[PDB]
Structure formats: structure tokens, C-alpha cells
């Protein structure tokens, strides 16, 4: 529950929430559709709506994950988000799963029309100084411009520093045996789902070092420089799925 200024878009969304709705969330990346729906999926909705995250990419076969296209298409038969459509034929064939029951839909693309696209807005200038405040202490409007800025240096003046050259910029200011690992995210496909554990153990093989017990405290370090995005956490071995943000995996 670190999130702020959702809270007043959060609930526009949620009163949208007649059989089945689209309710689509356009906005450019790193702006908070993630983050947003995340908000609205663990709100207070226990005596509305069942509930379920299904991640899906620009990569049919995600259908049974809870419990042969025809297999497929009759034991599917509420509130699912979908996280990341990247086009209109990938969701004009899924639809066919499970037809007051509704669908959460965040995108980045526009041509997504399907009734009327909730654009996410920016955040303003103050409600993006309580966000740096707090995930340094603890530019323009863009959260993941402004998670991207890490303060390595706490001197009595930052005015230094007054999306690639933002990444650059914490880039510059990690330890050279840092910057293989974080690198080693475009090795995957683009927004890939990493297990924790077998991440360590290729980073091992890989020549990047009680070795594995450093190597997660290389991956500890990359998530609170705000680099590495953890999915699931658990209580075996707390970090469990990890993964880099879009718009940070170009840069690698
Ligand atoms: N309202 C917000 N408050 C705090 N952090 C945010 C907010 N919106 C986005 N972020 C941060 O930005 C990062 C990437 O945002 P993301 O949810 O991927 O945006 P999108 O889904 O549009 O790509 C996340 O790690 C998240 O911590």
C-alpha cells in the first residue's frame, strides 16, 4: 500500500464498476496502470466481486492456472484483470473464455477503443514530491520517471541532477558488480516473469559473483535503487518472482 494520488482515480474506475464491460485504462508506460489496478483489485470489493490476475504480453495456454482449443474453451466456464493487451486480436480471441460480472483492461495503446477509454492522468506537482519523498527518505508528472531517480548521494545540495538517460543516471551510480546482473534482464523476453531462485543460480553460472546468499542481496539492492520490479514475495524465501519494467528493459 505504497501508492499515492490513486486513490481519487482509483474510485472513478471503480464506479464504472449492463452484463459485461470492457472498462479500458490507457496511458503511456511507467505511468501507474499497473500499479492502479493493483489498487482497485485489492480495494474493498469483497461484497462486490472470483477476483484473479491474468498476465498476459505480446506473446491461449493461460486458461488453467487456478485449477486442445477445445479443452481450452469449456472447463474456463466475477472480476479478472487483464494487465498488459498490446493489440485488438490478442483480446478479440480471449474473450471467448467466460462470457454482474466484468473485466478490468489496461493497455498502452490508444487503438484499444473498446465503453469509453479511462486515460490515467499525471501526477501533479505536488502529489509527485510526496512520491520522491517518500521512495528516498522512507519529474513531470511520471511515476516511474521519478521512482527511476535513486539518491546515491545525500549532500546538502542535489541540484545536480535538475526516459533512457533517467535509467542511465542510476545506471552510473551502481557498483560495477551490479551492473551485469541488472544488464542480464534482456536475456529474457520483454516483461518476462523471472523465478527468483533460478535467477540466482544463472547468475552464479554466469561468472557474475555464500554465493548465492550475496547474489540475493544483489538482487535486494536493485529493487530498493528501484530498478527491478518483485511480483510475488512468500514467507519460504521472500523474494520469489521478479521482473524489469518495459521501458527499463530497452535500456538493457
Ligand atoms: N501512483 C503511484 N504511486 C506510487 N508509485 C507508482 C504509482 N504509479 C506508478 N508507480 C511506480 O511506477 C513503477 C512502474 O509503473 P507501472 O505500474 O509499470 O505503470 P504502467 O502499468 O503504466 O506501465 C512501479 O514500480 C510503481 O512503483
Same mark, same amino acid.
Given at each position: 500500500?505504497?501508492?499515492?494520488?490513486?486513490?481519487?482515480?482509483?474510485?472513478?474506475?471503480?464506479?464504472?464498476?449492463?452484463?459485461?464491460?470492457?472498462?479500458?485504462?490507457?496511458?503511456?508506460?511507467?505511468?501507474?496502470?499497473?500499479?492502479?489496478?493493483?489498487?482497485?483489485?485489492?480495494? /474493498?470489493?469483497?461484497? *462486490?466481486?472470483?477476483?484473479?490476475?491474468?498476465?498476459?504480453?505480446?506473446?491461449?495456454?493461460?486458461?488453467?492456472?487456478?485449477?486442445?482449443?477445445?479443452?481450452?474453451?469449456?472447463?474456463?466456464?466475477?472480476?479478472?484483470?487483464?494487465?498488459?493487451?498490446?493489440?485488438?486480436?490478442?483480446?478479440?480471441?480471449?474473450?471467448?473464455?467466460?462470457?454482474?460480472?466484468?473485466?478490468?483492461?489496461?493497455?498502452?495503446?490508444?487503438?484499444?477503443?473498446?465503453?469509453?477509454?479511462?486515460?490515467?492522468?499525471?501526477?501533479?506537482?505536488?502529489?509527485?514530491?510526496?512520491?520522491?519523498?517518500?521512495?528516498?527518505?522512507?519529474?513531470?508528472?511520471?511515476?516511474?520517471?521519478?521512482?527511476?531517480?535513486? @539518491?546515491?548521494?545525500? @549532500?546538502?545540495?542535489?541540484?545536480?541532477?535538475? =526516459?533512457?538517460?533517467?535509467?542511465?543516471?542510476?545506471?552510473?551510480?551502481?557498483? *560495477?558488480?551490479?551492473?551485469? =546482473?541488472?544488464? *542480464?534482464?534482456?536475456?529474457? /523476453?520483454?516483461?518476462?516473469?523471472?523465478?527468483?531462485?533460478?535467477?540466482?543460480?544463472?547468475?552464479?553460472?554466469?561468472?557474475?559473483?555464500?554465493?548465492? =546468499?550475496?547474489?540475493?542481496? *544483489?538482487?535486494?539492492?536493485?529493487?530498493?535503487?528501484?530498478?527491478?520490479?518483485?511480483?510475488?514475495?512468500?514467507?519460504? @524465501?521472500?523474494?520469489?518472482?521478479?521482473?524489469?519494467?518495459?521501458?527499463?528493459?530497452?535500456? =538493457?
Amino acid at each position: 500500500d505504497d501508492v499515492v494520488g490513486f486513490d481519487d482515480e482509483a474510485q472513478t474506475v471503480i464506479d464504472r464498476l449492463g452484463d459485461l464491460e470492457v472498462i479500458p485504462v490507457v496511458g503511456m508506460p511507467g505511468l501507474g496502470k499497473t500499479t492502479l489496478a493493483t489498487k482497485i483489485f485489492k480495494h /474493498p470489493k469483497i461484497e *462486490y466481486e472470483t477476483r484473479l490476475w491474468l498476465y498476459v504480453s505480446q506473446s491461449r495456454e493461460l486458461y488453467l492456472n487456478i485449477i486442445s482449443e477445445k479443452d481450452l474453451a469449456l472447463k474456463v466456464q466475477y472480476l479478472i484483470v487483464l494487465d498488459d493487451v498490446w493489440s485488438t486480436d490478442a483480446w478479440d480471441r480471449i474473450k471467448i473464455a467466460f462470457p454482474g460480472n466484468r473485466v478490468l483492461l489496461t493497455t498502452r495503446d490508444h487503438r484499444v477503443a473498446r465503453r469509453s477509454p479511462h486515460d490515467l492522468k499525471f501526477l501533479t506537482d505536488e502529489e509527485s514530491w510526496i512520491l520522491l519523498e517518500k521512495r528516498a527518505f522512507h519529474c513531470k508528472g511520471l511515476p516511474l520517471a521519478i521512482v527511476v531517480i535513486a @539518491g546515491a548521494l545525500i @549532500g546538502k545540495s542535489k541540484t545536480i541532477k535538475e =526516459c533512457d538517460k533517467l535509467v542511465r543516471m542510476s545506471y552510473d551510480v551502481l557498483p *560495477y558488480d551490479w551492473k551485469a =546482473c541488472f544488464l *542480464y534482464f534482456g536475456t529474457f /523476453p520483454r516483461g518476462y516473469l523471472i523465478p527468483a531462485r533460478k535467477l540466482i543460480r544463472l547468475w552464479i553460472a554466469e561468472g557474475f559473483i555464500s554465493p548465492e =546468499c550475496k547474489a540475493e542481496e *544483489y538482487l535486494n539492492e536493485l529493487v530498493n535503487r528501484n530498478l527491478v520490479m518483485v511480483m510475488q514475495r512468500t514467507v519460504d @524465501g521472500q523474494i520469489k518472482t521478479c521482473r524489469v519494467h518495459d521501458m527499463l528493459y530497452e535500456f =538493457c
